[PDB]
Design a protein around this ligand. Structure first.
Ligand SMILES: *[C@@H]1O[C@H](CO)[C@@H](O[C@@H]2O[C@H](CO)[C@@H](O[C@@H]3O[C@H](CO[C@H]4O[C@H](CO)[C@@H](O)[C@H](O)[C@@H]4O)[C@@H](O)[C@H](O[C@H]4O[C@H](CO)[C@@H](O)[C@H](O)[C@@H]4O)[C@@H]3O)[C@H](O)[C@H]2NC(C)=O)[C@H](O)[C@H]1NC(C)=O
Ligand SMILES: *[C@@H]1O[C@H](CO)[C@@H](O[C@@H]2O[C@H](CO)[C@@H](O[C@@H]3O[C@H](CO[C@H]4O[C@H](CO)[C@@H](O)[C@H](O)[C@@H]4O)[C@@H](O)[C@H](O[C@H]4O[C@H](CO)[C@@H](O)[C@H](O)[C@@H]4O)[C@@H]3O)[C@H](O)[C@H]2NC(C)=O)[C@H](O)[C@H]1NC(C)=O
Ligand SMILES: *[C@@H]1O[C@H](CO)[C@@H](O[C@@H]2O[C@H](CO)[C@@H](O)[C@H](O)[C@H]2NC(C)=O)[C@H](O)[C@H]1NC(C)=O
Ligand SMILES: *[C@@H]1O[C@H](CO)[C@@H](O[C@@H]2O[C@H](CO)[C@@H](O)[C@H](O)[C@H]2NC(C)=O)[C@H](O)[C@H]1NC(C)=O
Ligand SMILES: *[C@@H]1O[C@H](CO)[C@@H](O)[C@H](O)[C@H]1NC(C)=O
Ligand SMILES: *[C@@H]1O[C@H](CO)[C@@H](O)[C@H](O)[C@H]1NC(C)=O
Ligand SMILES: *[C@@H]1O[C@H](CO)[C@@H](O)[C@H](O)[C@H]1NC(C)=O
Ligand SMILES: *[C@@H]1O[C@H](CO)[C@@H](O)[C@H](O)[C@H]1NC(C)=O
Ligand SMILES: *[C@@H]1O[C@H](CO)[C@@H](O)[C@H](O)[C@H]1NC(C)=O
Lengths: 457, 144, 452, 143, 143, 448
């Protein structure tokens, strides 16, 4: 007869959800001392990490049920709040803010975009008040009834904390690592769409390195797809699910704030500094975002060709600009050089495709205007507004796209020109574009099985 | 080799590489702490972050608790200090009706674990009884 | 000869940190209920109490560290819940007040005060004149030698914090579970007099579920004793100790604040709201309680009999109202519908018993206080926001706290008054049955067997 | 059936020895941990940090006592055994209840009070005996 | 007598191993835990999360090092025994100290300094040896 | 031969870990809201055990001793935690109108003590009260220049009041290592601070160390009974401090002969501010009397040891410190809850080519930036009565003059140094080592 055998170290696993350990590269900690991510994920990784053979094992993956995305969201939220926590409070700014236009070498576009404001501010001596002046963008300032009196928007909802100017929020690789007794299964199937079986399944202890980049409409840095274009929706036909397009070829972006900006230091109180935006040196122009037109329309053609596989083969496909709503979602928000950009993406999209070629279209470059606001309410929080300090000089950024977020407009039940718009993706989408292929699994080393051998007694 | 020594490759040969799976359950904890230790001026910011400190402390404590659970559960079955141990509980065809060649080849460990999941607790209970009886019998043999 | 046995059922009296569990985690309430937010872990859906045959064990409710554990837990939980809420430090300003006379009954004349004050609202350059209604217990007069000027009682060297209005303080039952390696022994002796040996001992991993009710003089929503009325006051001869009386049958009390009130929202900070008491709709009447009269007389007669069983038959038993002191201790304080009541209980403990046989309701007036100093911690104050509508609570008085006076020079009459004031006593009423025991499963014993 | 038959007799412990032992860690912390993490209230343990510290202290104390007992069993040549015999003779000084064989009527929690004295002496004797046994086994190999 | 025989020669200290074996766990951790929880005003340190987390980290790492050593003894076979030989021959490469001085006229500290760089080779050999022993045991019991 | 695995080997490795505090005589003696007794609630061994390590020689290094860094971090953290719940003093930063104190004041302190007054908040926000208090000139700075003044830390950091009930009096402190670690104590007579040491013993807790804060003279420390010792990481490198430990205590009596009367002002809803109300008696500068002949003998012994280290064919000079902050240019310390800053030019003024008492003037500073940080500032409450402290000077912190001076005369100044140095004078004996119980050895026996 056959007898029970208890094996320890059995290579089996279950689909568990646990805490993960973040760890940057060593060089990220050697330099960039004040970087928030290098400081938090300071524990160095393996300089030469090893992966594991495929082992002829298939495994089911589901990115939209992946708890790693929730872990990253909670971690970055906590890290952000804890980084802003020691920095100074700007409660004294919630005062009647007397403002005028700027009218200093302002092009036609930026008329009214900047405002020269002044106010009574506290000093180290609480009984002595100092009149000071600063420069505010119109998006951060709202009128009171009605040279003219205004207020900050944050003072209408919540007290605002100044970000510490020394702290850098630049993205770096993170390499989310599993704790002991856990492992991360990586899916290497080319053109793996999501929510399915995967065959080229490796096992690792840390992820390939994810930049925690913040952008709403378009992703900006990350991993390019292996081949062609990939479409990833939990339910394509649901019409309330984002589409998460990923590109095999990057798309160059030249972002810039051209104003030669200067910083003005005011003393709030004991050991407390407020960093106002001083007078702009020279002339003024709105922030630009340049995209290579040839590359852009080629990429859109590729996206249309890939989209036609999930829909009818002859379905006319229409790209329209985003609908109305909050500025966080109606535009392309992102962080560049410590400043915040909000770019109107109506310049992109705005086309129809009937025969795999742009109906409206046909070296050149598409220019997207961008507004800038200092007072941020990140992560769509209600309170906990943050005041981004100004950055002196001019600002340049070289970015890629590496996928974009689209939402399908349901419209009617009959499919003439099924429309796609820039999806107001939540940040979970931004990181789920990267944390797919990855599944966290607990190891259950103990198991039982029958044998021919009996214990000797 | 590696963390998973041909995991899911086959039920039979996979049992020939068990020491790495056994060692990882604390080797990972110790090596993670070693990685933290070699990086000074790291513990201060993490310690000031009370939430993160409690998170990783809970992670380490849970890992140790699972390892201790497994070791105690092996000790109760009279298998402490052995990765492979045979017992005196006969196998039941109710749990699985396959022969040895059917399972020790032409099957993977994960598939086998799925095949006998529902009865697992029952088997554990039986094992407990066995050890107790054996220990009592040993006392009788020491009385003689 | 020596055998080392592991897994032995051995006990030690020990103190440890228990954790708490909320029954079923029902989402009927939500609203960030502090007793639901805390005690996250689900309770056992089917607890398995284990009876221990032929096990007589000693208990001591006045050496029970569970009571201290729950006192610390409730204080810390209250501070944690109250801490991330609006601070009314800007409210501590000079108040220009008048009496409320509009459609007010005789008993409430001078009880309310309509007070106006300057507040800093949404901008440091703007001063907003606002007004609110305050109960006279929360407002005191300043510059009395010269409508009139008052301040809050918290201004007198104490900081005051507003309770978050969304947070509910309803006493959800809480099951206290011991951590690994410990157990909780239960007595189950229905005549257990507080200390000493007991039989019918059982074991649990979790308590039966306790409502963390806060009340000073009368114990509310507790558990009843089956063998008539139980008295627990250590050895009762020392009159300085409090006397916990657990009742045979629940006595019904209907308490209410009948005024139809309204909440007036004002803004102080960027996102800080202060909730003033708006104008009362309709007649202003006195908040009060109604106790079942004949039920109360029967219950007090039972208490009289059980007191005679310790002090004899040829003795006078006289119940008199409480002595002087602070409002927290001279009255019956409690939390009804989210509001704080302080009820004058002299209408109950007013009797003499020398009996030789060896529809109507009793009305208790009640005052309402918004500014609470809970647990008598000087230096902290909690501001209970006003609650719109009309408040009614129907509750079971299940026990009471009695202090005994001295014997004078003849020791002929025993005078009892309401007691309490230390919240631990309330917890003891629900923790005399339990005891926390540490397991030490490693022992030795002789045997005929020897190692080879 | 935890602590079942705690007052029955010393001689009727039997599988109760298992029932006590697994109750120290098995399930009581792991299934407890699963219950704690299940309703998605980790944030309320990370928040209210004192509560999290208290829970961690309870966990590590339980693990510490379990490892203390396991190390003591190892030092006495009894690792992995719920019941083990040793070679230390029993002293009438420790217990003179020898007019009748113990385990006939006596229960745990009563005899434990009788034996509460001299326990550290017994532990020292067991330690010395196991050390001598280990030295003898070291010598015997290749002797 | 913790580290009492530290300067004594090898073998001479081999009788003190139990005294050395204890106090790495329990004897220092459990006693310090009881002392820490003995006096009142625990909240004067429980409230300070920094000190609490530092002490918890120290305690947890002590337990983890102890568990590391125990698992290493288990995976090499013959755990729960302070002195236990194996079947791995000693290479002449490993300091070639074939003298009797290995067990006389040399302290354990100096010996640990001597073969510090050959440790992992020995540990891998022990792991492979235990694997072979367990496989042989299973095969023979099957026979 | 064959492999044997030994568990419980008595060996160790150098390591850094977290030590925990423990104190004795805490039953009722130090239950006066003392910081050290409150934090160090862990009792010590009533009968401490020490184990001598025969035939053991170990290398020690006081200038790389991580126990010192642990102590520095622990004391700073404990200080900040003690001050953290205590009341804030931001409203004091309001403009301050002052005049001179001329009421029976000696010529020495003319200008040292200023009678200031200011508007300040009350428990009610809308009502202000004019109050009067005394300030030492070190904590007051003129602005707009005529009589308007400001607190020093108005423009640098918020000022926190130390809780009046809380006392910072030193008590003995025992650092106890956790499990798996041991503290090796050296016992080499005249140990010079580093290198080999024999006679070594082991402990689980260190001897009682008083965490005394002083900046030029080590106070209430231990005595090197064998002979006067000089220690320095590199004698040649003049940038390194020199710790001189004495074999006899020098007697110093510091005092503030002023009968202080302390006011108590309410500033807010639950906040009390304490300010020096007045001085009942005469006003005389706080000062320290040092035993002159004892100081001469002590300097003679120190000069003898300095000659042994540097040579006995060269002149040795003592000159007062150089410029800088009061924290370094003067002997700064704590006495009875108040803070002293004493000018030490009366001591280190001599040359050694081959009933009297010295008086050191002392100023009093209330608003303090302890640990030479920038973002914090502590306000010591005034203390009623008359303060006197009697202290044993047990060691000196000297720095050789950087100039070569033709290698003719070597001038040593009381330059003080980092706070760590103080505890080094009490932590040079100890070393933290982690146990490594698991080892391997050859044998003649093999497993069956
Ligand atoms: C997607 O990924 C790309 C790159 O992979 C990102 O683009 C980079 O963004 C960072 C941060 O905005 C840029 O770093 C900044 O560069 C400025 C210009 O540097 C040039 O000039 C200096 C002059 O000394 C040279 O040394 C340097 O090599 C360059 O030639 C610097 O002036 C900035 O410094 C400021 O910030 C740092 C923060 O640590 C401070 O220490 C400084 O004192 C100063 O305040 C800063 O270093 C980087 O240049 C960009 N890349 C390129 C190629 O230009 C995208 O931002 C990213 N996408 C998103 C959405 O972020
Ligand atoms: C080096 O070590 C020496 C001692 O070895 C320290 O000097 C001692 O410092 C302490 C702390 O200031 C002094 O204690 C104080 O004594 C005051 C005077 O007490 C007199 O009256 C009592 C009556 O019982 C006598 O016992 C005593 O001998 C004196 O005759 C007290 O008034 C002080 O009390 C303070 O605290 C209490 C609370 O406990 C308050 O209620 C009081 O109001 C007051 O604030 C205090 O107890 C001690 O006297 C000093 N010794 C000597 C000999 O004078 C040095 O400070 C130390 N070196 C350094 C740098 O710290
Ligand atoms: C941003 O614009 C600059 C030009 O102002 C681009 O720079 C060069 O563009 C020419 C175009 O033929 C290329 O051949 C060069 O290789 C480019 N040089 C560099 C250093 O980039 C630049 O590529 C643009 N960047 C992005 C992201 O679009
Ligand atoms: C357009 O709408 C019609 C329904 O109004 C869709 O389905 C048609 O349904 C009728 C019902 O009898 C069938 O006879 C037709 O054959 C159906 N049409 C097709 C194409 O199958 C129709 O599918 C819709 N077309 C699109 C492109 O959405
Ligand atoms: C800016 O200019 C516009 C001109 O249309 C004017 O309406 C507006 O009031 C100006 N803003 C300020 C702050 O003066
Ligand atoms: C631009 O600024 C210059 C001074 O730098 C000034 O002379 C000129 O008039 C300005 N022009 C405009 C259009 O603002
Ligand atoms: C994109 O535009 C370029 C512009 O010259 C054109 O050559 C190319 O054919 C276009 N691609 C598609 C797919 O229409
Ligand atoms: C309970 O009754 C017993 C009976 O002997 C008595 O000894 C004990 O003191 C009583 N305790 C109380 C609290 O009444
Ligand atoms: C309790 O004792 C009685 C009489 O001694 C006995 O009959 C009964 O079995 C005991 N209960 C048990 C062993 O559960």
């Amino acid at each position: 007869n056959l007898w029970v055998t208890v094996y320890y170290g059995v290579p089996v696993w279950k689909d568990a959800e646990t805490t993960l350990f973040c760890a940057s590269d060593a060089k990220a900690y050697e330099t960039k001392k004040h970087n928030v991510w290098a400081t938090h994920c300071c524990v160095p990784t393996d300089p030469n990490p090893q992966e594991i053979h495929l082992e002829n094992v298939t495994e089911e993956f589901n990115m939209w049920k992946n708890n790693m995305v929730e872990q990253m969201h909670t971690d970055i939220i906590s890290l952000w709040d804890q980084s802003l926590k020691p920095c100074v409070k700007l409660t004294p700014l919630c005062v009647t803010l007397q403002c005028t236009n700027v009218t200093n070498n302002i092009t036609d576009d930026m008329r009214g975009e900047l405002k020269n404001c002044s106010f009574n501010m506290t000093t180290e001596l609480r009984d002595k008040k100092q009149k000071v002046y600063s420069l505010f963008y119109r998006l951060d300032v709202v009128q009171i009834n009605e040279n003219k009196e205004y207020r900050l928007i944050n003072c209408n909802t919540s007290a605002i904390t100044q970000a510490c100017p020394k702290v850098s929020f630049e993205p770096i690789p993170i390499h989310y690592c599993a704790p002991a007794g856990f492992a991360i299964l990586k899916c290497k199937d080319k053109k793996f769409n999501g929510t399915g079986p995967c065959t080229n399944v490796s096992t690792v202890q840390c992820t390939h390195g994810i930049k925690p980049v913040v952008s709403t409409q378009l992703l900006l840095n990350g991993s390019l797809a292996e081949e062609e274009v990939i479409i990833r929706s939990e339910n394509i036909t649901n019409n309330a699910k984002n589409i998460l397009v990923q590109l095999n070829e990057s798309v160059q972006i030249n972002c810039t704030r051209p104003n030669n900006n200067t910083r003005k230091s005011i003393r709030i109180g004991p050991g407390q500094w407020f960093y106002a935006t001083g007078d702009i040196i020279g002339d003024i122009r709105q922030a630009h975002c340049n995209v290579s037109k040839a590359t852009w329309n080629e990429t859109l053609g590729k996206v249309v060709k890939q989209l036609r596989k999930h829909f009818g083969n002859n379905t006319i496909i229409r790209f329209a600009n985003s609908s109305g709503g909050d500025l966080e979602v109606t535009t392309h928000s992102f962080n560049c050089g410590g400043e915040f950009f909000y770019c109107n993406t109506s310049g992109l999209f705005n086309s129809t495709w009937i025969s795999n070629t742009s109906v409206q279209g046909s070296n050149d470059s598409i220019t997207l205007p961008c507004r800038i606001k200092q007072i941020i309410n990140m992560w769509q929080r209600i309170g906990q507004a943050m005041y981004a300090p100004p950055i002196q000089g001019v600002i340049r950024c070289v970015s890629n796209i590496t996928g974009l977020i689209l939402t399908r407009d349901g419209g009617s039940t009959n499919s003439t020109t099924e429309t796609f718009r820039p999806g107001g993706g939540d940040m979970r989408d931004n990181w789920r574009s990267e944390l797919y292929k990855y599944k966290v699994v607990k190891i259950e080393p103990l198991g039982v099985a029958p044998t021919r051998c009996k214990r000797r007694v | 080799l590696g963390f998973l020594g041909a995991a899911g490759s086959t039920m039979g040969a996979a049992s020939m590489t068990l020491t790495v799976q056994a060692r990882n359950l604390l080797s990972g904890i110790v090596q993670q702490q070693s990685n933290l230790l070699r990086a000074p001026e790291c513990q201060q910011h993490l310690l000031k972050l009370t939430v993160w400190g409690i998170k990783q402390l809970q992670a380490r404590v849970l890992a140790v608790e699972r390892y201790l659970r497994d070791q105690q559960l092996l000790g109760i079955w009279g298998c402490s200090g052995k990765l492979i141990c045979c017992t005196n509980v006969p196998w039941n065809s109710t749990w699985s009706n396959r022969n040895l060649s059917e399972i020790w080849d032409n099957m993977t460990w994960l598939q086998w674990d799925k095949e006998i999941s529902n009865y697992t607790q029952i088997i554990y209970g039986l094992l407990e009884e066995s050890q107790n009886q054996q220990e009592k019998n040993e006392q009788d043999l020491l009385a003689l």
